[PDB]
Design a protein around this ligand. Structure first.
Ligand SMILES: O=S([O-])[O-]
Ligand SMILES: O=S([O-])[O-]
Ligand SMILES: O=S([O-])[O-]
Ligand SMILES: O=S([O-])[O-]
Lengths: 65, 68
């Protein structure tokens, strides 16, 4: 459903297969990055955190290449 | 469980404003072809060709939005 809290975890860049962005803007109350992982589970993350931004850029660069 | 594979690419062109995320399918992780799977809020995803400029663009746009 909507993320209400953010993980304390710091994910490995190779453990994620993608992500979704949740905006306070659409149905949910807060903004979140939802990482989709190789365990076919999703992890809710703080959009402002340096690791979250970094993983997302590593993934999109991989696609660019 | 195993990831259900895209076996081919959509012809549809979805406006990027409806795309809320993506997952990348890699042939080197077991499926037969590479794909980008675009997610929408209505939980209907579409399978896209990673080689296409349009596809790489939308993916980069999604990341730049996260950057801020
Ligand atoms: O298949 S990756 O390069 O999007
Ligand atoms: O449906 S499209 O935007 O690959
Ligand atoms: O999720 S895998 O098949 O790249
Ligand atoms: O595992 S696949 O790339 O034939």
């Amino acid at each position: 459903d909507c993320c209400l809290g953010y993980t304390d975890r710091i994910l490995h860049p190779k453990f994620i297969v993608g992500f979704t962005r949740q905006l306070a803007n659409e149905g949910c109350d807060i903004n979140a990055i939802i990482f989709h992982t190789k365990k076919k589970l999703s992890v809710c993350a703080n959009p402002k955190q340096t690791w979250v931004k970094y993983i997302v850029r590593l993934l999109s660069k991989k696609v660019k290449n």
